Symmetry: C4
Subunit: 200 residues, 4 copies
């Protein structure tokens, strides 16, 4: 039983590695390993037969579909959901799932505050920069990325073609982003700590 | 009474989308949608007749004004205050408003500490770099942006033309910024959590 | 007695503005305003006659000295200590001073952990990159800045000439920096909140 | 007994300085200082004779080995473990060691969540960008660094050759990284504060 669990974890990790390696530019030996991992996945699934069973289903749907290029890239992407098959073995990942399910309102509030701040500061920086020639931002949607990476403090990069009002707006954006990403997050963190210590 | 609320939210979101799209470079169909959204806004306003009523007023003042380019960009910017019309429907946004109103002293203290740190580290880095040729910063105001994005950890970008003393000042700036943005923020976060859990 | 306080705050702010503006490249009208601010500073000082009196002293020592270029830049820099004359009027800045005085051990521990992490990750990234040609870092001191801005999450900029081991070291540096800047800071924040709420 | 401790701290600091300086491009006077520091290290070790004794051992193994270039760079790197000889004298560093030993599960959970987020967002951004010509990322491993520095908010640099879907994935990556680095860290911080206040 524990040997079967360790085999399952090794097979999931092997499938993740094979995914990532077959995207490498240096590269059957991948398709045979892939079909072996999928044979094990579907054997485990058809022995077992919630969200973990849905994950086990999604873990083989792409392989069985591949037997417009947009749909093809979408399914080759959803082949990455094999990494969530580690949830059945990892207890911290199940705690993270319970936390995400229990703080849905707070995640929505975080996304809402970010949406509002992004629209606000993108409009502000677009209208601050639009008065000049060779404007940095071409539209308000063109500043959405800048606003996201400034509010999250990830950082944009080179802001040299920006003027004084653009930099004033950017300073306000940095401050407001710190605050707005700091307000919902403590509640999610408290939920995680609750579930974690309840488990252990 | 709930269908009217969902229509109001859809109209506010449509006006936000129309704002952002009419700034796009690909672009009457926007002015007719705009005048329809404003007709609904003013109908709701003149049926209703605090800060939310002021927001409802500001949401139509620009449209009615547009019937030096600096004033024009300023009013075309204040057309973005339609996004705060979501406060009447979103409870988290009203909680955020109550939080901001209740932590005014702490917001002022945050801005004050940032002002002091920005002046201090801009002076320090300007005088550290000014001893060389082709100085990175041309004045102490020219380093204000750098100091803001280093204290907020948003990051400046390429700091390669900076010397040893400039980098020592930058290290101190990073540390001091972490601390100063970390001191007022817990109080604002505690106020938000108080109002949020009082509501729910 | 309150008009005198508001005059003092206006004069301190005017001296800060004059400092920052006389560094501008566009620029007696500054030296006369400066000597008026210093006449007021020394009048207030010689009417009054702790750390605030030391600040009042340092606020006029540069003006009275200016009546190798390294010493000159050093004193023209210490002219920035006029911004700490706002401590006598701002209560939050005195709270910040009390906090800094009460968390000296924690500030030293933060600086010590950063020193250790910086030396460690600078050595690691230098020896990871040194095996190649056109190495990004020329010495272990040459990576000190990179390590500081990666541990503080301020960010370095372009890390494209870095290899796989350099990026593994950089990932570890980012994680370890998050942790080490997160460990001492809560104690300083708790001290600040204690002093702040004790005052108010 | 205290003079010997201050000599030991001075010798450790001198060896750290000599390490960092002998990597400088400007540079026996370093090898003689090095052999003196090692003579003191081994004298202290052979007078004393846990993890601190292992550190004292590792602090001289490289010098005694140097009496493929990969092994040589590896040992010249492990010469940096002299900086951990400060643990015997610094109490905060022993507190940090106790904290790291007591929060091993949480450190593993942090690394696990980062691994999962990195694989997820690297796959997502690779498949979002791969539909175009001159793709920014060449493989899913080629986006591992980008995902790490976006989730840690250290920042990547120039993301201009990235498209709309790449920037949507990057926004999600920034948000998810904030959350996942925010969930395990409070427990490690609480452990550190516990050990710190237990000591003092
Ligand atoms: K950051
Ligand atoms: K950053």
């Amino acid at each position: 039983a524990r040997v079967v669990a360790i085999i399952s974890v090794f097979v999931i990790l092997l499938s993740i590695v094979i995914f990532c390696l077959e995207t490498l530019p240096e590269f059957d030996p991948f398709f045979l390993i892939e079909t072996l991992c999928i044979i094990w996945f579907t054997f485990e699934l058809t022995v077992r037969f919630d969200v973990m069973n849905v994950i086990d289903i999604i873990a083989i749907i792409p392989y069985f579909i591949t037997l417009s290029l947009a749909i093809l890239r979408v399914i080759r992407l959803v082949r990455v959901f094999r990494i969530f098959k580690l949830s059945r073995h990892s207890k911290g990942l199940q705690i993270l799932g319970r936390t995400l399910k229990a703080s849905m309102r707070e995640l929505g509030l975080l996304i809402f505050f970010l949406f509002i701040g992004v629209v606000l500061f993108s409009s502000a920086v677009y209208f601050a920069e639009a008065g000049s020639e060779n404007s940095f931002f071409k539209s308000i949607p063109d500043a959405f990325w800048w606003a996201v990476v400034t509010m999250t403090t990830v950082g944009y990069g080179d802001m040299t073609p920006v003027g004084v009002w653009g930099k004033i707006v950017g300073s306000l954006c940095a401050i407001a982003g710190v605050l707005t990403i700091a307000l919902p997050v403590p509640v999610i963190v408290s939920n995680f700590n609750y579930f974690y210590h309840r488990e252990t």
